[model samples]
Target: KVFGRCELAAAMKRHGLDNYRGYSLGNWVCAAKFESNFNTQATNRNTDGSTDYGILQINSRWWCNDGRTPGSRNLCNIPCSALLSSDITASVNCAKKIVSDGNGMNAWVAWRNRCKGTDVQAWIRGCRL
Candidate 1:
C-alpha cells in the first residue's frame, strides 16, 4: 500500500518513532518519501545481494532473514516477508531496533543523502500533529 505523505507522518508518529534517536518524525517521513515513497511493500534489491523492504526499506542483509540476501544477519529476528505487510507494525518495530543499533537515522543512506539537512517539516505541512 502506498501512503500519502501526511498519512504516513501521522501513522509513524503514533507508532512511537516521533523522537527516536533524537530524530524527529518528519526526519523519518522525509526519508520514507525518497526511500519507498511511503510504500508498505516496497522492495529494492541491492546489487550487493541484499533487498530492502517496507516503508523504511529495512535491509535483508543485516536486519531480516530472506534466505537469499547472501549473508543475512537477521538482527531483527524476523522474516523478510514480515516487512511487506500492509499493517506496518512489524516494519516500524524493526526500524526502532535499527536506530537502537547506534547508527541512528543514518542507518539509511537515503536519509543522509536526501533528508539529512532538508526541510523535513514540510513533510507534514497539512497534517495535524
Candidate 2:
C-alpha cells in the first residue's frame, strides 16, 4: 500500500495536537495501528467468517450500521472531525465523555483485546506506533 505522506501529514495535523496527546491520538493510533496498520482500506478474515475493513478495521457490516450505503452511515462516513480529531490530553478528556464514565483505560483495553496477538502494546510504546 502506497500511503501518501502528504495526506498522512495533513490527516495527522488535523487529528493530532500536542496538548491533547494524553488520550486521543494514543488510543486511536494504537488501536488503528494494531487493527489495520493504519490502512484506511483494510480487510481480514476471522474464524467465524467475519470481515474487518478500513483504517479502524471496523467490521463494515457491524459497527457501520448501514454505513456502507451511499447515503448511510459507514466507516468512511465517520465524521471528518472525528477522523481528524486528536490530542492526548483532549483525547483523554473527550474519551471520558464518549466512553463509559471516564473509563479511558477500559476502552483502550477493550480495543486491545479486540485486536490482540499483534504485540499491540509493545509496538505502541516502542516504535511509537
Candidate 1 residue pairs that clash: none
Please list the C-alpha lDDT of all candidates, in the order they appear: 0.89, 0.41
Clash counts for the predictions, in order: 0, 16
Candidate 2's displacement at residue 15, Å, is 4.7
lDDT of 1 at 97: 94
Worst 10 residues of 2 by lDDT: 83-92
Tens-digit lDDT string for candidate 2 (56-117)? 44443323432333333343334322322332232223333434444443434436575434
Q: What lDDT does candidate 2 reach at residue 118?
A: 45
Give the candidate number with the greatest lDDT. Answer: 1
- Model 1 scores a C-alpha lDDT of 0.89
lDDT per residue for candidate 1 within 7-124, as digits (tens), equals: 8888898899898778898898999888998888899988898999988999998899999977569999999989998888899999999998887888999999999988988888
